[PDB]
């Protein structure tokens, strides 16, 4: 998955 940015 993606890195959390919000």
């Amino acid at each position, epitope marked *: 998955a*993606e890195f959390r*940015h919000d």
Partner: antibody, heavy 122, light 113 residues
């Protein structure tokens, strides 16, 4: 804003590394705030290790997520990283950088420590 | 795992030349919130790295506009017009959209002679 890594330089294969990052100029309870750890072998590239957020969320480099544990001491402005069962491959300089999110205009690694050194050898 | 591959790996320049640095990702790096987290870092010997560009084309506060970054999707460039002795060092591009977060092997900005 500053950061300073401390920890044992030199461990032996399989021992546990416990690394400390003492920061200031910011606070890990500040909405969006976070620190991560990045290490770099001699004459080589940067490898990102793990990252911890203000809401205690965490995120690990999956190829190591297992030998890694990240944690904070909000009250005492500190961030720790533990690597279990180390080996010569973990020989490197370890940095901690700050990185905040929510607002994309602050979302980057603006501040890094001076870096601390580890050699794994028997 | 996004592989960032930079070019050249060494770049000899004369003080006051222009210099480009290409960086291409092994796959698209536009996060699902719409932001492309491409960043450039510069490291001098014995220093830590320091942030030059973020979000592809944005200069970080304190960075001379003689540095500029371009790119889209999977293909990115750093340009330095009028290179200065303080610009000599190693340049890493970085993507921060996918886990794990990753940097290039870095490019060595060196002096011509």
């Amino acid at each position: 804003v500053t950061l300073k890594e401390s920890g044992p330089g030199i461990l032996q294969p399989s021992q546990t590394l416990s690394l400390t990052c003492s920061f200031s100029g910011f606070s890990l309870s500040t909405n969006g705030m976070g620190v991560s750890w990045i290490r770099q072998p001699s004459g080589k590239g940067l490898e990102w290790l793990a990252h911890i957020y203000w809401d205690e969320d965490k995120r690990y480099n999956p190829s190591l997520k297992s030998r890694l544990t990240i944690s904070k001491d909000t009250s005492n402005n500190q961030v720790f990283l533990k690597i279990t069962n180390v080996d010569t491959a973990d020989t490197a300089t370890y940095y901690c950088a700050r990185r905040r999110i929510i607002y994309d205009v602050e979302d980057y690694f603006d501040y890094w420590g001076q870096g601390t050194t580890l050699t794994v050898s028997s | 795992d996004v592989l960032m591959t930079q070019t050249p790996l060494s770049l000899p320049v004369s003080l006051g030349d222009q210099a480009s640095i290409s960086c291409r990702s092994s796959q698209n790096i536009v996060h699902s919130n719409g932001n492309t987290y491409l960043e450039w870092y510069l490291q001098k010997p014995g220093q830590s790295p320091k942030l030059l560009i973020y979000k592809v084309s944005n200069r970080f506060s304190g960075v001379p506009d003689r540095f500029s970054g371009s790119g889209s999707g999977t293909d990115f460039t750093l340009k330095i017009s009028r290179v200065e002795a303080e610009d000599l060092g190693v340049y890493y591009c970085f993507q921060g959209s996918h886990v794990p977060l990753t940097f290039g092997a870095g490019t060595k900005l060196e002096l011509k002679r």
